[PDB]
Amino acid sequence: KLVRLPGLIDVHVHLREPGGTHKEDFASGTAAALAGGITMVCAMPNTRPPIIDAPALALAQKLAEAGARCDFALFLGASSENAGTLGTVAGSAAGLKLYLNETASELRLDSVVQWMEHFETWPSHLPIVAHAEQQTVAAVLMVAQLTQRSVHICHVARKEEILLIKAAKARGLPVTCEVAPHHLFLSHDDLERLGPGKGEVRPELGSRQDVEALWENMAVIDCFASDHAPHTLEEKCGSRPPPGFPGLETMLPLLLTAVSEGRLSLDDLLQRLHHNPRRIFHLPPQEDTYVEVDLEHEWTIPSHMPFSKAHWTPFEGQKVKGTVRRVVLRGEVAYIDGQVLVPPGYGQDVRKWPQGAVPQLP
Amino acid sequence: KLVRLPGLIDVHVHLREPGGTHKEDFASGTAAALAGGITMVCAMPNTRPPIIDAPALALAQKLAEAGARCDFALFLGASSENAGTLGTVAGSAAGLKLYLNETASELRLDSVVQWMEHFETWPSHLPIVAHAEQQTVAAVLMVAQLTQRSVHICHVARKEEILLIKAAKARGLPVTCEVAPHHLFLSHDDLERLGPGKGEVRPELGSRQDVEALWENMAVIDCFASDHAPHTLEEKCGSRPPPGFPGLETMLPLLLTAVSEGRLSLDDLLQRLHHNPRRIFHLPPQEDTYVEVDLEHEWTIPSHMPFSKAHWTPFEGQKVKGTVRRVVLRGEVAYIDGQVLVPPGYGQDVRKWPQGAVPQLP
Ligand SMILES: [Zn+2]
Ligand SMILES: [Zn+2]
Ligand SMILES: [Zn+2]
Ligand SMILES: [Zn+2]
Ligand SMILES: [Zn+2]
Ligand SMILES: [Zn+2]
Ligand SMILES: [Zn+2]
Ligand SMILES: [Zn+2]
């Protein structure tokens, strides 16, 4: 009755530690990952302090080693000050994250010249991912070409963006992309229900035509990734709502529902949650690691999933068919039927495994 | 000084056992694979007897288990009689092989309707690969669409074929392809030297414009695979030369030379010899498995490589930069500097590993 899947990978999560641990920490965020059938996560650098230099990465690595319940890699973040300074630690990171749109954070880049500097100085064999919306996609693609290397575009959300990427792929350009579940399963039609606080996310929810274009262009999507971005309900409904949705616990049930409806195949899902994450980010296999899912059980998403400290979900009320029943991680039962059974600290930094270093010429 | 690579995969080898063991057997062919930095091979079904039914597959599996030195999967072959009969054994095979052009073998299909029957009856979640040259590529793509599934095109050799595949990918069609080293590193310009016997291969050597088009369209190539097709020199130079070249021992040195010249990157190589083979064929990781190569050593390909029983090579006289120094397979030293150190029978059928079954809906 159960379907065995390999260990799934989410290349885009915000786990809030250090410095935002009321929103989530490594222990709670990785519990949510395991409950969502995810055994490896790549954590974004917009923490407090942000992971923009070697001391901050060293702290984050120890916090993750002590708190993570699944395996992980940590991104470095590009800043206005750190181009040319990350060479000694770069290979220990998941990749470099460029935040190219609106942020108040120390990740703000004020000029395309700063993007060029990062593309020129970051080691050429290591991943670069970008938060790049609308015309920014075209702009960062131009920088990538000028510097003759690849780029991965995070959370593609619009017809405009997926068609631009499609055209770049048709020209043989080295660009990959990911799409998040909210941009496949929610739209403007849902803003009335969510309200303007809860509904706040970047990239914003798309029109129905945006959603339909992402589905029609599934072939262009290399990865699914949650952009798990936990904030509490008080923050989402307060005066200055921060953008982002929690998503680890709902991503796989939503996508399994689509598989059951024939909207994409099981293989299409596994390419996008396993094989393509591995190959774009050079992430190693996990021995003795698998996920068992039940595809027959129908349930309704509640007002909050059990594990994320966000303690809310924008998918409340959607009917899904697909449940995570058991997760085994490196030979140990990590999750069964609503209970996480590996402690904080069971998870490891995959970039420290011999098989997890990115291959490079001498 | 040495570069560590993951265990490379060759999805297209002819190992001649059962029934052609003067040309190669599992033990000699897998020794050649290991010496070429390959730790997993997918063996084609055009043996004697051909692997076209369950009894023949059972024999071949035991011969491979007893003789193979690296890990493997075995293809089933489509025949004019076996559509609808392979369902119980299909999941144990690498995939189904369709030989769509000229053959005298029991793999000859005489009608496109027989291709349709195979596409309709072979389990939809399992791989199908085709030997399809020139217009046959377009024809089998049509059959795939009619049956709404994917296909993988073997040894793409021509500008015509790579551009057709490029156009299909631009339309979002589920097609992947592989290219063999002889179609990247040899051309018509080499037929004078090779002669009409040794030079016989299918698909035939291309023009210089064919070769240049494959390089220019590297983005369209999903995999490299040798089409290792050993025949003895007596056969190649005799009255009725069979088509095919040996290639396991020369593939990686040729491609490492191209990497050293900047013609493609190390990552481009590893996508095509590791990640994409894994994901197209659902081949499992190999624990504690890696290849160490030396990129500085220049050498000239001799008149025959050490291991293949073909005892000749069409690349004789080419200068290469790139050598396999050490192979470790599942924790054991399998090859060092010209000596194979695992015995016949060390290799295993990866389709019998729990992680090597192709995932499917219940
Ligand atoms: Zn983002
Ligand atoms: Zn991302
Ligand atoms: Zn994000
Ligand atoms: Zn890799
Ligand atoms: Zn062939
Ligand atoms: Zn092939
Ligand atoms: Zn062949
Ligand atoms: Zn797979």
Side-chain angles (χ1 to χ4, degrees), chain A residues 55-113:
Chain A
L57 178 65
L59 173 64
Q61 285 168 331
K62 304 310 304 190
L63 295 176
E65 286 182 336
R69 306 170 187 270
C70 72
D71 298 327
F72 62 87
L74 306 180
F75 279 97
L76 278 157
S79 78
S80 62
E81 301 308 313
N82 64 6
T85 73
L86 302 177
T88 63
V89 296
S92 74
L96 182 69
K97 173 74 176 295
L98 274 63
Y99 284 88
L100 301 184
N101 296 115
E102 232 142 53
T103 37
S105 68
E106 240 180 312
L107 289 305
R108 182 172 189 168
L109 304 181
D110 42 81
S111 165
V112 175
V113 177

Coordinates of all heavy atoms in Angstrom, one line a residue, chain A residues 55-113:
Chain A
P55 N 33.0 34.2 10.4 CA 32.6 34.0 11.8 C 31.1 33.6 11.9 O 30.7 32.7 12.7 CB 32.9 35.3 12.5 CG 34.0 35.9 11.7 CD 33.7 35.5 10.3
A56 N 30.3 34.3 11.1 CA 28.8 34.0 11.2 C 28.5 32.6 10.7 O 27.7 31.9 11.2 CB 28.0 35.1 10.4
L57 N 29.2 32.2 9.6 CA 29.0 30.8 9.1 C 29.5 29.8 10.2 O 28.8 28.7 10.4 CB 29.8 30.6 7.8 CG 29.8 29.2 7.2 CD1 28.3 28.8 6.8 CD2 30.7 29.1 6.0
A58 N 30.6 30.0 10.9 CA 31.0 29.1 11.9 C 30.0 28.9 13.0 O 29.8 27.8 13.5 CB 32.4 29.5 12.5
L59 N 29.5 30.0 13.5 CA 28.4 30.0 14.5 C 27.2 29.2 14.0 O 26.7 28.3 14.6 CB 27.9 31.3 14.9 CG 26.7 31.4 15.8 CD1 27.0 30.8 17.1 CD2 26.2 32.9 15.8
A60 N 26.8 29.5 12.8 CA 25.6 28.8 12.2 C 25.8 27.3 12.1 O 24.9 26.6 12.3 CB 25.2 29.5 10.9
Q61 N 27.0 26.9 11.6 CA 27.3 25.5 11.5 C 27.2 24.8 12.8 O 26.6 23.7 12.8 CB 28.7 25.3 10.9 CG 28.9 25.6 9.5 CD 30.4 25.7 9.1 OE1 31.3 26.1 9.9 NE2 30.7 25.3 7.9
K62 N 27.7 25.4 13.9 CA 27.6 24.7 15.2 C 26.2 24.7 15.7 O 25.7 23.7 16.3 CB 28.5 25.3 16.2 CG 30.0 25.4 15.9 CD 30.6 24.2 15.4 CE 30.4 23.1 16.3 NZ 31.3 21.8 16.0
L63 N 25.4 25.7 15.5 CA 24.0 25.7 15.9 C 23.2 24.7 15.1 O 22.4 23.9 15.7 CB 23.4 27.1 15.7 CG 24.0 28.2 16.6 CD1 23.3 29.5 16.2 CD2 23.8 27.9 18.1
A64 N 23.5 24.5 13.8 CA 22.8 23.5 13.0 C 23.3 22.1 13.4 O 22.4 21.2 13.5 CB 23.1 23.8 11.5
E65 N 24.6 21.9 13.6 CA 25.0 20.6 14.1 C 24.4 20.2 15.4 O 24.1 19.0 15.6 CB 26.5 20.5 14.1 CG 27.2 20.5 12.7 CD 28.7 20.4 12.7 OE1 29.4 20.8 13.7 OE2 29.2 19.9 11.7
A66 N 24.1 21.1 16.2 CA 23.5 20.8 17.6 C 22.0 20.7 17.5 O 21.4 20.0 18.4 CB 23.9 21.9 18.6
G67 N 21.3 21.4 16.6 CA 19.9 21.4 16.6 C 19.2 20.7 15.4 O 18.1 20.3 15.6
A68 N 19.9 20.5 14.3 CA 19.2 19.9 13.1 C 18.9 18.4 13.4 O 19.7 17.7 14.0 CB 20.1 19.9 11.9
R69 N 17.7 18.0 12.9 CA 17.3 16.6 13.0 C 17.4 15.9 11.7 O 17.4 14.7 11.6 CB 15.8 16.5 13.5 CG 15.5 17.2 14.8 CD 14.0 17.3 15.0 NE 13.6 18.1 16.1 CZ 13.4 17.5 17.3 NH1 13.7 16.3 17.6 NH2 12.9 18.3 18.3
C70 N 17.5 16.6 10.6 CA 17.8 16.1 9.3 C 19.1 16.7 8.8 O 19.7 17.6 9.4 CB 16.7 16.3 8.3 SG 16.4 18.0 7.7
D71 N 19.6 16.2 7.7 CA 20.9 16.7 7.2 C 20.7 18.1 6.5 O 19.6 18.4 6.1 CB 21.6 15.6 6.3 CG 21.8 14.4 7.1 OD1 22.1 14.5 8.3 OD2 21.8 13.3 6.5
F72 N 21.8 18.8 6.3 CA 21.7 20.1 5.8 C 22.9 20.6 5.2 O 24.0 20.0 5.3 CB 21.3 21.1 7.0 CG 22.4 21.1 8.0 CD1 23.4 22.0 7.9 CD2 22.4 20.2 9.1 CE1 24.5 22.0 8.8 CE2 23.4 20.2 10.1 CZ 24.5 21.1 9.9
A73 N 22.8 21.7 4.4 CA 23.9 22.6 4.0 C 23.4 24.0 4.2 O 22.3 24.3 4.2 CB 24.3 22.3 2.6
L74 N 24.4 24.9 4.5 CA 24.1 26.3 4.8 C 24.6 27.2 3.7 O 25.8 27.1 3.3 CB 24.8 26.7 6.1 CG 24.5 25.9 7.3 CD1 25.3 26.5 8.5 CD2 23.0 25.8 7.6
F75 N 23.7 28.1 3.2 CA 24.1 29.1 2.2 C 24.9 30.2 2.9 O 24.7 30.5 4.0 CB 22.9 29.7 1.5 CG 22.3 28.9 0.4 CD1 21.2 28.1 0.6 CD2 22.9 29.0 -0.9 CE1 20.7 27.4 -0.4 CE2 22.4 28.3 -1.9 CZ 21.2 27.5 -1.7
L76 N 25.9 30.8 2.1 CA 26.4 32.1 2.4 C 25.6 33.1 1.7 O 25.0 32.8 0.6 CB 27.9 32.2 1.9 CG 28.9 31.6 2.9 CD1 30.2 31.2 2.2 CD2 29.1 32.6 4.0
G77 N 25.5 34.3 2.2 CA 24.8 35.4 1.6 C 25.8 36.5 1.0 O 26.8 36.8 1.7
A78 N 25.5 37.0 -0.2 CA 26.2 38.1 -0.7 C 25.8 39.4 -0.1 O 24.7 39.7 0.1 CB 25.9 38.2 -2.2
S79 N 26.8 40.2 0.2 CA 26.6 41.6 0.8 C 27.3 42.6 -0.1 O 28.1 42.3 -1.0 CB 27.1 41.7 2.2 OG 28.5 41.8 2.2
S80 N 27.1 43.9 0.3 CA 27.8 45.0 -0.4 C 29.3 45.0 0.0 O 30.0 45.9 -0.5 CB 27.2 46.3 -0.1 OG 27.2 46.6 1.3
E81 N 29.7 44.2 1.0 CA 31.1 44.3 1.5 C 31.9 43.0 1.3 O 33.1 43.1 1.5 CB 31.1 44.7 3.0 CG 30.4 46.0 3.3 CD 30.9 47.1 2.4 OE1 32.1 47.3 2.3 OE2 30.1 47.9 1.8
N82 N 31.3 41.9 1.0 CA 32.0 40.6 1.1 C 32.5 40.0 -0.2 O 33.1 38.9 -0.1 CB 31.3 39.6 2.0 CG 29.9 39.2 1.4 OD1 29.6 39.6 0.3 ND2 29.2 38.4 2.1
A83 N 32.3 40.6 -1.3 CA 32.8 40.0 -2.5 C 34.4 39.9 -2.4 O 35.0 40.9 -2.0 CB 32.4 40.9 -3.7
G84 N 34.9 38.8 -2.8 CA 36.3 38.6 -2.7 C 36.8 38.2 -1.4 O 38.1 38.0 -1.2
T85 N 36.0 38.0 -0.4 CA 36.4 37.7 0.9 C 36.0 36.3 1.3 O 36.4 35.8 2.4 CB 35.8 38.6 2.0 OG1 34.4 38.4 2.2 CG2 36.1 40.1 1.6
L86 N 35.2 35.6 0.5 CA 34.6 34.3 0.9 C 35.3 33.1 0.4 O 34.9 31.9 0.7 CB 33.1 34.2 0.5 CG 32.3 35.4 1.0 CD1 30.9 35.2 0.5 CD2 32.3 35.4 2.6
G87 N 36.5 33.2 -0.2 CA 37.1 32.1 -0.9 C 37.5 30.9 -0.1 O 37.5 29.8 -0.5
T88 N 37.9 31.2 1.2 CA 38.4 30.1 2.0 C 37.2 29.3 2.6 O 37.4 28.1 2.8 CB 39.2 30.6 3.2 OG1 38.5 31.5 4.0 CG2 40.4 31.4 2.7
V89 N 36.0 29.9 2.8 CA 34.9 29.2 3.3 C 33.9 28.8 2.2 O 32.9 28.0 2.5 CB 34.2 29.9 4.4 CG1 35.2 30.0 5.6 CG2 33.8 31.3 4.0
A90 N 34.0 29.3 1.0 CA 33.0 29.1 0.0 C 32.6 27.6 -0.2 O 31.4 27.3 -0.3 CB 33.4 29.7 -1.3
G91 N 33.6 26.8 -0.3 CA 33.3 25.4 -0.6 C 32.6 24.6 0.5 O 32.1 23.5 0.3
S92 N 32.6 25.2 1.7 CA 31.9 24.6 2.9 C 30.4 25.0 2.9 O 29.6 24.4 3.7 CB 32.5 25.0 4.2 OG 32.2 26.4 4.5
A93 N 30.0 25.9 2.0 CA 28.6 26.3 2.0 C 27.8 25.6 0.9 O 28.4 25.0 0.0 CB 28.6 27.8 1.7
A94 N 26.5 25.6 1.0 CA 25.6 25.1 0.0 C 25.9 25.8 -1.3 O 25.9 25.2 -2.4 CB 24.2 25.3 0.4
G95 N 26.1 27.2 -1.3 CA 26.3 28.0 -2.4 C 26.3 29.5 -1.9 O 26.3 29.7 -0.7
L96 N 26.2 30.4 -2.8 CA 26.1 31.8 -2.5 C 24.7 32.3 -3.0 O 24.3 32.0 -4.1 CB 27.1 32.6 -3.3 CG 27.1 34.1 -3.0 CD1 27.6 34.5 -1.6 CD2 28.0 34.8 -4.1
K97 N 24.0 33.0 -2.1 CA 22.7 33.6 -2.2 C 22.8 35.0 -2.5 O 23.3 35.7 -1.7 CB 21.8 33.2 -1.1 CG 20.4 33.9 -1.1 CD 19.6 33.4 -2.2 CE 18.1 34.0 -2.3 NZ 17.5 33.6 -1.0
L98 N 22.2 35.4 -3.6 CA 22.1 36.9 -3.9 C 20.7 37.3 -3.8 O 19.7 36.7 -4.4 CB 22.5 37.2 -5.4 CG 24.0 37.4 -5.7 CD1 24.8 36.3 -5.4 CD2 24.2 37.8 -7.1
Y99 N 20.4 38.3 -2.9 CA 19.1 38.8 -2.7 C 19.0 40.1 -3.6 O 19.5 41.1 -3.1 CB 18.9 39.2 -1.2 CG 18.6 38.0 -0.4 CD1 19.6 37.3 0.2 CD2 17.3 37.5 -0.2 CE1 19.4 36.2 1.0 CE2 17.1 36.4 0.6 CZ 18.1 35.7 1.2 OH 17.9 34.6 1.9
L100 N 18.4 40.0 -4.7 CA 18.5 41.1 -5.7 C 17.3 42.1 -5.7 O 17.4 43.1 -6.4 CB 18.7 40.5 -7.1 CG 19.9 39.7 -7.2 CD1 20.1 39.2 -8.7 CD2 21.2 40.4 -6.8
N101 N 16.3 41.8 -4.9 CA 15.2 42.7 -4.8 C 15.2 43.4 -3.4 O 16.1 43.2 -2.6 CB 13.9 42.0 -5.2 CG 13.9 41.5 -6.6 OD1 14.0 40.4 -6.9 ND2 14.0 42.5 -7.6
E102 N 14.1 44.0 -3.1 CA 13.8 44.8 -1.9 C 14.2 44.0 -0.6 O 13.5 42.9 -0.4 CB 12.3 45.1 -1.8 CG 12.0 46.5 -1.5 CD 10.7 47.0 -2.3 OE1 9.7 46.3 -2.2 OE2 10.8 48.0 -3.1
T103 N 15.1 44.5 0.1 CA 15.4 44.0 1.5 C 16.0 45.2 2.3 O 16.8 46.0 1.7 CB 16.3 42.8 1.6 OG1 17.4 42.9 0.6 CG2 15.5 41.6 1.5
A104 N 15.7 45.2 3.6 CA 16.4 46.1 4.4 C 17.7 45.5 5.0 O 18.5 46.2 5.6 CB 15.5 46.5 5.6
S105 N 17.8 44.2 4.8 CA 18.9 43.4 5.4 C 20.2 43.9 4.9 O 20.4 44.5 3.8 CB 18.7 41.9 5.2 OG 18.9 41.6 3.8
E106 N 21.3 43.4 5.6 CA 22.7 43.5 5.2 C 22.9 42.8 3.9 O 24.1 42.7 3.4 CB 23.6 43.0 6.3 CG 24.5 44.1 6.9 CD 25.4 43.5 8.0 OE1 24.8 42.9 8.9 OE2 26.7 43.7 8.0
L107 N 21.9 42.1 3.3 CA 22.1 41.5 2.0 C 21.7 42.4 0.8 O 21.8 41.9 -0.3 CB 21.1 40.2 2.0 CG 21.4 39.0 2.8 CD1 22.7 38.3 2.7 CD2 20.5 38.5 3.8
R108 N 21.3 43.6 1.1 CA 21.0 44.5 0.0 C 22.2 44.8 -0.8 O 23.3 45.2 -0.3 CB 20.5 45.8 0.6 CG 20.0 46.8 -0.5 CD 19.3 48.1 0.1 NE 18.7 48.9 -0.9 CZ 17.9 49.9 -0.7 NH1 17.5 50.2 0.5 NH2 17.4 50.6 -1.7
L109 N 22.1 44.6 -2.1 CA 23.0 45.1 -3.1 C 22.4 46.3 -3.8 O 21.3 46.3 -4.2 CB 23.4 44.0 -4.1 CG 23.9 42.6 -3.5 CD1 24.2 41.6 -4.6 CD2 25.1 42.9 -2.6
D110 N 23.2 47.4 -3.9 CA 22.6 48.6 -4.5 C 23.0 48.8 -6.0 O 22.4 49.7 -6.6 CB 23.2 49.8 -3.7 CG 24.6 49.7 -3.3 OD1 25.4 50.1 -4.3 OD2 25.0 49.4 -2.2
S111 N 23.8 47.9 -6.6 CA 24.2 48.1 -7.9 C 24.4 46.8 -8.6 O 25.0 45.9 -8.0 CB 25.5 48.9 -7.9 OG 26.1 48.9 -9.2
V112 N 24.1 46.7 -9.9 CA 24.4 45.5 -10.7 C 25.9 45.3 -10.7 O 26.4 44.2 -10.9 CB 23.8 45.7 -12.1 CG1 24.3 44.5 -13.0 CG2 22.3 45.7 -12.1
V113 N 26.8 46.3 -10.5 CA 28.2 46.1 -10.5 C 28.6 45.2 -9.3 O 29.5 44.4 -9.4 CB 29.0 47.5 -10.5 CG1 30.4 47.3 -10.4 CG2 28.6 48.3 -11.8

